[PDB]
C-alpha cells in the first residue's frame, strides 16, 4: 500500500510533461479535421463506384443465360486490392446478355498471380459458361487473359493466376494480405478499404487513446510507484540500459492494451457509445499525467520520454502484428478525386513530421523555462549590490581604487557574502601611451588612437633588467575563450593578471602595492575586473565582468555585464539538451537530403525562387542550433574540469560558457519563431480564409514602392532640418487603400467565377 502515494512534494512545475501532452492533442484535432474532409469524399466515392484494358469486351460465351445478375472481381497484389463492380448499363444483364466492365479502379495491381472472380447466379442456372472479359493492356500492362469457362453453383467464385482442395494455405493467405494493413491500426488511416463500417475517423480516436494512455501509465510509474524497486533517482540511468527504460515501456504497453482492445471491439462489429468513453479516458489520463509530472527531477523526464517512445515502438513492431496474425489464425472527375486523395495523404504525412519537429524545438527552447525568472532577479540583485550606477559614471581621475576598496572587497570577503566560486582577477593590455590626444572638439565615439599592445615580460615598476624572466609577465590568451567587444576594439584573454584575494586583511596590502608602485598609468588601455557568482538556491552561476576603456588618456569608459547561466555538462549523462541536439541534427540531415533530392530530380536553374532559399535557411538554423548547444555543453565541462584542479588558486574565466549559453538560447528561439510563422500561413486551406495571404503577397510591390518614396522624402527633410538652425503613413492610413483594392479584386475573383 506504500507504493501508490500522493507526493505533492515540491511546487516546481515541470513543462516537459505538459508540452508533450499539449501537442498530441493539437495533432489529433488537425488530423481529425483532415480525415473528416477525406471521409466526406471517400463515402461518396464508395457508394458511387489500371491493371487491365478498356477494349470492347462484349461477351459471347453462350445463350441460355437470361438473368439480372452482378459479378465481382478481387484483383489483389502488391499493395493493390480492388472491390466488386456494380450492375449498370443498357441491357443491365438482360435475357441472353453479355458481360463487359471497365470501371475507374485506381488499384493498380502488380504483375503477379493474385486474382479471383465471383459470379452470382441470380435466378436459374445458366447454360452459358461465362468465362471472363478480355483485357490485355491499356494503361499499365498488368493483365493476363486466361479464362476457365466453367459454371459452378449460385454465387460461386473461381481463382486462377495472373470445392475444398486446400484449406490452411489459401483460406489463410487471403487474410495476411487483406487485414495486415487494415487491422494494423497504426498504418490504417491511410489504407482503409472502401465500403467498410470503421470510418477512418474513429481510428484516429483509438490511436490518440493509445498515445495518451501510454503517457499516463508511464507517468504513473515514474512518480507514484517509486518504492517497489527504489530506482527513480538512485539507480535510474538516463541512458537506456535495456532494463531501466525499455522494460518499463513494454510492461506499460501490455498492461494498458486490454482497454484499447475493449474500446476497439465496441467500435468494430457495431452494426457511438465508445466515442465519449475514449475522450473521457484521454482526458483523465492527461489529467493524471499533468498532476503527477509536477514533481519530476530533471533527470527523470528524459527517462519518461524514452520509456514512452519505447512503448510506442512496442505497440508498433510486435503487438499489432501479433493481433492481426492471431485474427488470421482464428479465421472525368475520377482523375480529380485521385489528385485530391494524393494531396491529402501528403498533407497527413507532412502534418506528423511538422508536429514532431515542433515538439523537439519546444523541448529544446522551453525545456528548462522555470530557470528564466530566477535569472532576471539574480542579475538585478548582483547589479544593485555592486552599486551599478557609480561605476558607469567613472571617468579617469585615478579614482577606480576608492570604488574598488569601498564596495568590491566587502562584497567579496564579507561574512554573509557570496560563495564567489573562487578569487577575482584584474587584467591589462597595452603599449606606447597616447601622446595626450587633442582636447578641443572631442570625438563622439570614434576615439581610436591607433597603437599596439605589449607582450614582453616586464618587472615590478617599468624596467626588466637582469632580474630574470620578468615577474609581471604576460599571460598569453588561453584561446577559444572570450573577446569583450569593447568600445575601443576587440580584446582577448591575454594580459597581466593580479590575484587580489586571499583573506581581505591581506588584500589591502595588494591594493596599496598596486596603487603605490606605479602599476596602472602611462599606458592604461584596460583593467578588466572580473569575478563569478554561484547561487545554490536556484542553481545558477553568473559571469560578472567590468571593464574600463581609456581612449583619450584622461577619460574613462565603463562597461559591466552580468550573465546568469546554468552549468550543463556532457558528462552529466543523457541530459535533455543532448537529446534535443542529437534529434535536431537528424532533422537537419533529413531536410538537407530532401532538398538535395529535389535539386537532382528537378535539376539546376532552381535558384531565384524562395523555396530553395527558405529550405536552406531552415537547415542552416537547425544545424547551427544543435552545434552551438553541443559546443556550449563541451566548453562547460572543460572549464569545470580545469577549475577543479587547483580550486583555490586559479580563476578559470567562465565568461566563454556564458556567451555560448546565450547564443544557443537566442538561436533556438528564432527557429521556433519561423515554425510558428509557418503555421499562420496554413490557414489558407480553409475555404474563405485563403485570400489574406494572396492579398498580402500581390500588394507587396506597391507597399515597397511607397516605402521607397517615403525614405527619399524623409532623407530630404532630414537634410533640410539639419543645417537650417542646428505620421504621413501611420495616422492617415494610406496602406488601407492599396490592400483594399487587392482584397476586393481577389474576393470577386473567388465568387463570380
Amino acid at each position: 500500500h506504500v507504493r501508490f502515494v500522493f507526493p505533492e512534494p515540491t511546487a516546481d512545475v515541470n513543462y516537459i510533461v505538459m508540452l508533450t501532452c499539449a501537442v498530441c492533442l493539437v495533432t489529433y484535432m488537425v488530423m481529425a479535421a483532415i480525415l473528416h474532409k477525406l471521409d466526406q469524399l471517400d463515402a461518396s466515392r464508395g457508394r458511387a463506384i489500371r491493371f487491365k484494358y478498356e477494349i470492347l469486351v462484349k461477351t459471347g460465351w453462350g445463350r441460355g443465360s437470361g438473368t439480372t445478375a452482378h459479378v465481382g472481381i478481387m484483383l489483389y497484389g502488391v499493395d493493390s486490392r480492388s472491390g466488386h463492380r456494380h450492375l449498370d448499363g443498357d441491357r443491365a444483364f438482360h435475357r441472353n446478355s453479355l458481360d463487359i466492365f471497365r470501371i475507374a479502379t485506381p488499384h493498380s495491381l502488380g504483375s503477379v498471380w493474385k486474382i479471383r472472380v465471383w459470379h452470382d447466379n441470380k435466378g436459374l442456372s445458366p447454360a452459358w459458361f461465362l468465362q471472363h472479359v478480355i483485357v490485355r493492356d491499356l494503361q499499365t500492362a498488368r493483365s493476363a487473359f486466361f479464362l476457365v469457362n466453367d459454371w459452378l453453383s449460385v454465387e460461386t467464385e473461381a481463382n486462377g493466376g495472373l470445392a475444398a482442395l486446400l484449406r490452411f494455405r489459401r483460406l489463410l493467405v487471403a487474410e495476411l494480405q487483406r487485414g495486415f494493413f487494415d487491422k494494423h491500426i497504426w498504418l490504417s488511416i491511410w489504407d482503409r478499404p472502401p465500403r467498410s463500417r470503421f470510418t477512418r475517423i474513429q481510428r484516429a480516436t483509438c490511436c490518440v487513446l493509445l498515445i495518451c494512455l501510454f503517457l499516463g501509465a508511464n507517468a504513473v510509474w515514474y512518480g507514484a510507484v517509486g518504492d517497489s524497486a527504489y530506482s527513480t533517482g538512485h539507480v535510474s540511468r538516463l541512458s537506456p540500459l535495456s532494463v531501466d527504460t525499455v522494460a518499463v515501456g513494454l510492461v506499460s504497453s501490455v498492461v494498458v492494451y486490454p482497454v484499447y482492445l475493449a474500446i476497439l471491439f465496441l467500435f468494430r462489429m457495431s452494426r457511438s457509445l465508445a466515442h465519449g468513453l475514449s475522450l473521457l479516458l484521454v482526458a483523465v489520463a492527461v489529467a493524471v499525467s499533468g498532476w503527477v509530472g509536477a514533481s519530476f527531477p530533471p533527470g527523470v523526464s528524459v527517462a519518461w520520454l524514452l520509456s514512452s517512445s519505447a512503448s510506442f515502438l512496442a505497440s508498433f513492431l510486435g503487438w499489432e502484428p501479433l493481433k492481426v496474425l492471431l485474427e488470421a489464425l482464428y479465421f472525368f472527375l475520377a482523375k480529380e478525386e485521385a489528385r485530391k486523395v494524393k494531396r491529402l495523404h501528403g498533407m497527413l504525412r507532412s502534418l506528423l513530421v511538422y508536429m514532431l519537429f515542433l515538439l523537439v524545438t519546444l523541448l529544446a527552447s522551453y525545456g528548462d523555462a522555470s530557470c528564466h525568472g530566477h535569472a532576471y532577479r539574480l542579475q538585478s540583485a548582483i547589479k544593485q549590490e555592486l552599486h551599478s550606477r557609480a561605476f558607469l559614471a567613472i571617468t579617469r581621475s585615478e579614482e577606480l581604487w576608492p570604488w574598488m576598496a569601498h564596495v568590491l572587497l566587502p562584497y567579496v570577503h564579507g561574512n554573509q557574502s557570496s560563495p564567489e566560486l573562487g578569487p577575482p582577477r584584474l587584467r591589462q593590455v597595452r603599449l606606447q601611451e597616447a601622446l595626450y590626444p587633442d582636447p578641443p572638439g572631442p570625438r563622439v565615439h570614434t576615439c581610436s588612437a591607433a597603437g599596439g599592445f605589449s607582450t614582453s615580460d616586464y618587472d615590478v615598476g617599468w624596467e626588466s633588467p637582469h632580474n630574470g624572466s620578468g615577474t609581471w609577465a604576460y599571460s598569453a590568451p588561453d584561446l577559444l575563450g572570450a573577446w569583450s567587444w569593447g568600445s575601443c576594439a576587440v580584446y582577448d584573454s591575454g594580459g597581466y593578471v593580479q590575484e587580489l584575494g586571499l583573506s581581505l586583511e591581506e588584500s589591502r596590502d595588494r591594493l596599496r602595492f598596486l596603487q603605490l608602485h606605479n602599476w596602472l598609468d602611462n599606458r592604461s588601455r584596460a583593467v578588466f575586473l572580473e569575478l563569478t557568482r554561484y547561487s545554490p538556491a536556484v542553481g545558477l552561476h553568473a559571469a560578472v565582468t567590468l571593464r574600463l576603456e581609456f581612449p583619450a588618456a584622461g577619460r574613462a569608459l565603463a562597461a559591466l555585464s552580468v550573465r546568469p547561466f546554468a552549468l550543463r555538462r556532457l558528462s552529466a549523462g543523457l541530459s535533455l539538451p543532448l537529446l534535443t541536439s542529437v534529434c535536431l541534427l537528424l532533422f537537419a540531415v533529413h531536410f538537407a537530403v530532401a532538398e538535395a533530392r529535389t535539386w537532382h530530380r528537378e535539376g539546376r536553374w532552381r535558384v531565384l525562387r524562395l523555396g530553395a532559399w527558405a529550405r536552406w535557411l531552415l537547415v542552416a538554423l537547425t544545424a547551427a542550433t544543435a552545434l552551438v548547444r553541443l559546443a556550449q555543453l563541451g566548453a562547460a565541462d572543460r572549464q569545470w574540469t580545469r577549475f577543479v584542479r587547483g580550486r583555490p588558486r586559479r580563476f578559470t574565466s567562465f565568461d566563454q560558457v556564458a556567451q555560448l549559453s546565450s547564443a544557443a538560447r537566442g538561436l533556438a528561439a528564432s527557429l521556433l519563431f519561423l515554425l510558428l510563422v509557418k503555421a499562420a500561413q496554413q490557414l489558407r486551406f480553409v475555404r474563405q480564409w485563403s485570400v489574406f495571404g494572396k492579398t498580402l503577397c500581390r500588394a507587396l510591390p506597391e507597399l515597397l514602392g511607397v516605402t521607397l518614396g517615403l525614405v527619399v522624402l524623409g532623407v530630404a527633410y532630414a537634410q533640410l532640418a539639419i543645417l537650417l538652425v542646428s505620421r504621413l503613413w501611420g495616422a492617415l492610413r494610406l496602406g488601407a487603400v492599396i490592400l483594399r483594392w487587392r482584397y476586393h479584386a481577389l474576393r470577386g475573383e473567388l465568387y463570380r467565377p
Binding site: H372, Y376, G666, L672, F673, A680, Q688, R740
Partner: protein, 184 residues
C-alpha cells in the same frame, strides 16, 4: 450568472462580521480584517464586470430605423472575416512575443514575463514604448527586432483590418440599396 455570483458573495461576506464584534469586546487585541478586505475586492471586480456587460446589452434595442439597421448589419457581417484574420494576426503576435521573452527577457525588465511582453507589444502599437533598453540589452538584435516588428505590424498587418471593414461596409450598403431599388 454573474449577478447570482455577486449576490452570493455579498450575502456570504456581510453575514460573518464576528471579527468586528470580537474586536469591540476587547480593544487591546489585533483587529483581523483581512478576509473582509479580500472579499470586498472580489465583490468590486464582479460588480464592475456585471455593470459593463449590462451596459453592453443595450445594443439589443437600438435598431429603430434604417441608418442603425445597416450599421448593425455591417458590424455583424464582417465578424466572420475579422475572426478569421485575427487568428493569423495573433499567431504572429505571440510568435514575436515569445522571441522577445526568450532573448530580452533576462535583462530588460520590460520583457521579464510573457504577460509583460504582450503588454509591451501592445504599448508599442500606441507609440508609447521607445527603444532605450533593448539597445543596451543587445545593440545588434534590439534594432532588428524593433524595426521588423514596426514594419510588419504597422505597414502591413494592421491595415488589413481596415481593408476588410471598408469593403464589407461598401458591399452591404451597395446590395441593400440595390434590393431597396428593385423590390421597392
Amino acid at each position: 450568472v454573474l449577478s447570482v455570483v455577486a449576490i452570493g458573495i455579498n450575502i456570504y461576506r456581510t453575514s460573518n462580521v464576528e471579527v468586528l464584534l470580537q474586536f469591540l469586546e476587547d480593544q487591546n487585541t489585533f483587529p483581523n480584517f483581512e478576509h473582509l478586505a479580500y472579499w470586498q475586492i472580489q465583490f468590486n471586480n464582479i460588480a464592475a464586470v456585471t455593470v459593463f456587460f449590462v451596459w453592453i446589452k443595450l445594443f439589443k434595442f437600438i435598431n429603430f430605423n434604417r441608418t442603425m439597421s445597416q450599421l448593425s448589419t455591417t458590424m455583424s457581417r464582417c465578424a466572420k472575416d475579422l475572426f478569421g484574420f485575427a487568428i493569423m494576426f495573433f499567431i504572429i503576435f505571440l510568435a514575436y512575443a515569445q522571441l522577445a521573452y526568450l532573448v530580452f527577457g533576462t535583462q530588460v525588465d520590460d520583457f521579464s514575463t510573457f504577460q509583460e511582453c504582450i503588454f509591451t507589444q501592445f504599448r508599442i502599437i500606441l507609440g508609447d514604448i521607445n527603444f532605450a533598453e533593448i539597445e543596451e540589452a543587445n545593440r545588434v538584435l534590439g534594432p532588428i527586432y524593433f524595426t521588423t516588428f514596426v514594419f510588419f505590424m504597422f505597414f502591413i498587418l494592421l491595415n488589413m483590418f481596415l481593408a476588410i471593414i471598408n469593403d464589407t461596409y461598401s458591399e452591404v450598403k451597395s446590395d441593400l440599396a440595390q434590393q431597396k431599388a428593385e423590390m421597392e
